[PDB]
């Protein structure tokens, strides 16, 4: 272990007194030694703490210490850039530029795989970041001018511009940025304009199209629609399999521009993109299956296809509709999008759904009323034969609601599970909105679409838990789209067939799914349940019966469904109806003991809050007070001869808590001397509060704080 002391004393002296070979051995030693790793790493941070000047001359005199020396420079730059004088740091910057030009101009850099090039570019980035605004106004023109000499220099500068586009908030300030840098932007376009037409080098063109893609939004419109740029991207760079995915992004970015003086060129863009896409991809080709076997590169084309069609059509569909000739091409392109919409993935679905939402929204705002059950809306007439495909598509693809909790595993196992954030939920809400619009377009077709698949489900044909889940989720999202007289006639058939489906299905695996679907599909229709009493009775009784279920997740969901029903239908529970002589709440209060036994305590609390909300709706003078008495008689009786549930019912029932609060009021103060916040906050009688409940405070409460 004597050599360890020699190697330790060797490195400490050379730094404060530089030799290349001794520096080389150390960085290799740390990588190939266990102790050497830790000791030299500590030695590296100790050497880095000193200063920079040894670094640059170390570079001048290699790859491992290049990464090392670049770490030294990059780190010391961010620290002392504000401290050092502007001229000296600019001198370091000139050294960086010269190093970049030199190393990028060497053919062996390509054989070096350009790792040193990438890191050296990062250093330029870190410098340019803080320097650019107040130091270099000509950096743009300098790079453009230096890119006109060689290939490697140019393409590397395209990477630089790409990185500059990464390190470069507000609408107005960005528009001022465009108007101020438009002069410097024209040159950046002209460079790419030159390369794309004159160059034979694919690696150069790829980075060129990448940079032109990123700088496209800021570049003035005069260099875009007034030139052959659109036709160039159409005929030349669209066909080539090398640039198929990167050029599609550019055309997408082109389509995002708001029309002002240019109208025809956009139609030409659409016609030519479709002319070339129909040749690139066949209409008969299934997109989903080609995406499944699609390579990493093959998928980006499809995603960019959906991204493009959505981007363009959202702005210029009106311009395409206007001409009678473009109507056919629009139908074909819409067909294309409809095909792409069938790809099973997280991203692409939301991308094309972003279009379907907008589509449904516009013609809904045109004609809110459904047709039918002439004067056909002009906007509807065009999209008419492609509308029913969207409804048929939207119903089957809808995701899980935030309300219900039932999850299927890949092996076919059913279980309750909660998922992260709002990504899966926000999607569901969006599909819900879109389907609502489309349902408003025609409720008849929507009715038939759902009735047909329900009949196939009752028959059992193609019956899987997921297949019924998607449908019932759809029906739950339709809530409020159809008129009362039509909604009743339609929903009663759905409920009846759903109950019969629950009867046919055997086992807990099926029963859990059917209960889940039947609970969510019920909770979303309170306006139907308040119309029919006996119907609501059968439903709520089914809830209470499903709270007897042993399978986890079902009963917890049944409690939430009960709350969801109790909230809106609160007025229908207390009153004695025409069909039944005894109030439903009265029946519940004597039957609760057998129901709440299987439930978790946390679920029981929610159940009590539901009952408290039901009984709080009734007035009827002293009648509701007697019902509150009967409701809380069981837990409260043993108190005279826990409080959390009491204050829960206090906030649930509301102000008329005086009948139960009064009897236990005095004892609270008497024991406390040895709940009010909730009642007072909910009380509507300040006159009674101040003159009765307020005086017994001073002695028991105010003096207590002193004592």
From Swiss-Prot:
Record GO cellular component, one term: nuclear membrane
Modified positions (Phosphothreonine) in chain numbering: 422
Outcome after substituting residue 542 to A: Does not abolish Ran binding activity and partially abolish nuclear export complex formation
Modified-residue entries (Phosphotyrosine), positions: 428
Effect of residue 329 to A: Does not abolish Rex-mediated mRNA export
An example Gene Ontology molecular-function term: nuclear export signal receptor activity
Further comment found in the protein's record: Cellular target of leptomycin B (LMB), a XPO1/CRM1 nuclear export inhibitor.
Family per similarity comment: Belongs to the exportin family.
Protein name: Exportin-1
Entire protein: shown range: 3 to 790 of 1071
């Amino acid at each position: 272990a004597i050599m360890t002391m020699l190697a330790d004393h060797a490195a400490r002296q050379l730094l404060d007194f530089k030799l290349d070979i001794n520096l080389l051995d150390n960085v290799v030693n740390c990588l190939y030694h266990g102790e050497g790793a830790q000791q030299r790493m500590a030695q590296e941070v100790l050497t880095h703490l000193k200063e920079h000047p040894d670094a640059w001359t170390r570079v001048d005199t290699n790859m491992n210490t290049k990464y090392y020396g670049l770490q030294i420079l990059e780190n010391v730059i961010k620290t002392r850039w504000k401290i050092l004088p502007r001229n000296q740091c600019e001198g370091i910057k000139k050294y960086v530029v010269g190093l970049i030009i030199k190393t990028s101009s060497d053919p062996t850099c390509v054989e070096k795989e350009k790792v040193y090039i990438g890191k050296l570019n990062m250093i330029l980035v870190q410098i340019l970041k803080q320097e650019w605004p107040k130091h270099w106004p000509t950096f743009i023109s300098d790079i453009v001018g230096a890119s006109r000499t060689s290939e490697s220099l140019c393409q590397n500068n395209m990477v630089i511009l790409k990185l500059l586009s990464e390190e470069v908030i507000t609408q107005v300030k960005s528009k001022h940025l465009k108007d101020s840098m438009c002069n410097e932007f024209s040159q950046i376009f002209q460079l790419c304009q030159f390369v794309m037409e004159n160059s034979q080098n694919a690696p150069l063109v790829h980075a060129t199209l990448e940079t032109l893609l990123r700088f496209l939004n800021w570049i003035p419109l005069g260099y875009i629609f007034e030139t052959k740029l659109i036709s160039t991207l159409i005929y030349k760079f669209l066909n080539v399999p090398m640039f198929r995915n990167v050029s599609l992004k550019c055309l997408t970015e082109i389509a995002g521009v708001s029309v002002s003086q240019y109208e025809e060129q956009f139609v030409t863009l659409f016609t030519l993109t479709m002319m070339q896409l129909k040749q690139m991809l066949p209409l008969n080709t299934n997109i989903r299956l080609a995406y499944s076997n699609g390579k990493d590169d093959e998928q980006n084309f499809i995603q960019n296809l959906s991204l493009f069609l959505c981007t363009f059509l959202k702005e210029h569909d009106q311009l395409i509709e206007k001409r009678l000739n473009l109507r056919e091409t629009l139908m074909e392109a819409l067909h294309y999008m409809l095909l792409v919409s069938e790809v099973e993935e997280t991203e692409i679905f939301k991308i094309c759904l972003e279009y379907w939402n907008h589509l449904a929204a516009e013609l809904y705002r045109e004609s809110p009323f459904s047709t039918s059950a002439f004067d056909v809306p002009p906007r509807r007439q065009l999209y008419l034969p492609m509308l029913f495909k969207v409804r048929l598509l939207m119903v089957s693809r809808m995701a899980k609601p935030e309300e219900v909790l039932v999850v299927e595993n890949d092996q076919g196992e059913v279980v309750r599970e909660f998922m992260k954030d709002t990504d899966s939920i926000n999607l569901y809400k969006n599909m819900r909105e879109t389907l609502v619009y489309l349902t408003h377009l025609d409720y008849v077709d929507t009715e038939r679409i759902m009735t047909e698949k329900l009949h196939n489900q009752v028959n059992g044909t193609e019956w899987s838990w997921k297949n019924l889940n998607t449908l019932c989720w759809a029906i739950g999202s339709i809530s409020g789209a159809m008129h009362e007289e039509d909604e009743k006639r339609f929903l009663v058939t759905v409920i009846k067939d759903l109950l019969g489906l629950c009867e046919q299905k055997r086992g807990k695996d099926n029963k859990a799914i059917i209960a889940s679907n039947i609970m969510y599909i019920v909770g979303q229709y309170p306006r139907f349940l308040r119309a029919h009493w006996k119907f609501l009775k059968t439903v709520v009784n089914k809830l209470f019966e499903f709270m007897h279920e042993t399978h986890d997740g079902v009963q917890d969901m049944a409690c939430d469904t009960f709350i969801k029903i109790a909230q809106k239908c609160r007025r229908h529970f207390v009153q004695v109806q025409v069909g039944e002589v005894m109030p439903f709440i009265d029946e519940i209060l004597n039957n609760i003991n057998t129901i709440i036994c299987d439930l978790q305590p946390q679920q029981v609390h929610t159940f009590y809050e539901a009952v408290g909300y039901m009984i709080g709706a009734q007035t009827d003078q002293t009648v509701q007070e007697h019902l509150i008495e009967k409701y809380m008689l069981l837990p409260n009786q043993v108190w005279d001869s826990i409080l959390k549930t009491n204050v829960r019912a206090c906030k649930a029932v509301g102000h008329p808590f005086v009948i139960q609060l009064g009897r236990i009021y005095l004892d609270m103060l008497n024991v406390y001397k040895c709940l009010i916040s909730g009642w007072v906050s909910r009380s509507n009688d300040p006159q009674m509060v101040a003159e009765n409940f307020v005086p017994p405070l001073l002695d028991a409460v105010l003096i207590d704080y002193q004592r």
